[PDB]
């Protein structure tokens, strides 16, 4: 399970940026996991 520690919204909304190797919350723009 992977959740944003600032929006605190369930279920979390998440978009994976494959071309940058990142996982990004779609609301605050925060970067969750890299590489």
């Amino acid at each position: 399970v992977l959740t944003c520690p600032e929006c605190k919204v369930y279920p979390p909304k998440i978009v994976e940026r494959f071309s940058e190797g990142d996982v990004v919350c779609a609301l605050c723009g925060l970067v969750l996991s890299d590489k």
């Binding site: 600032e6 605190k8 779609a26 609301l27 605050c28």
Partner: protein, 253 residues
Amino acid sequence: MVQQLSLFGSIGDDGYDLLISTLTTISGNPPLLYNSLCTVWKPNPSYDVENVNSRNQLVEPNRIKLSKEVPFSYLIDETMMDKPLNFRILKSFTNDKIPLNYAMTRNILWSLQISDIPAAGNNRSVSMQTIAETIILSSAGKNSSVSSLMNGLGYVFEFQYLTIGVKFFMKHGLILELQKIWQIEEAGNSQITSGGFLLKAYINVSRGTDIDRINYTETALMNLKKELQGYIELSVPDRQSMDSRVAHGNILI
């Protein structure tokens, strides 16, 4: 556009009088009565705003606030002209009923204002919020009215409320407000801040880039909070409560 740095709190009316005296002991100024009337408007759901860039989230829909001052002759009933117009009248404003009803406000229909959710992060000691403001001076035409104007822009009415309270001006541009809020509907008037006063201490900064000024403002606000220790607890409100975007609905009151 300002960066408003704010701290919040609340008190029960029992200590109200006492509180007032203490403030005058600190500021050296007497309280000044004031009132206001705010109307909230939201984008029309009949119109499909496909222009919201869903794949990029360039922008999200938001709510507009229109404020105006209303003379006390609309707020004083036939039992109250004998008393002078000062702060003590607030002691009689404990009932959910109020002279200003729905029909008068409908007959009325300024300052236009938009805001954003406060800044993220847990290393912020005061609520920092960004505000964009403009002023409407007058109008003309065949349908000159606030309602027609906001429908021309693309917004519709959502609700409204009435604030009555007192103001204290301290040094360094610090403003302290004691408020009572009455929501108004055709069904009637209900006091949300029932049996108490809402306390808000805030400062305004004109330019967000200047950081020396912001540090000074935070220092003044924390010093004020540390002065009132033991009487009233001033706290940073919830960041998710001061969010006014249409997608999610809640209202700090």
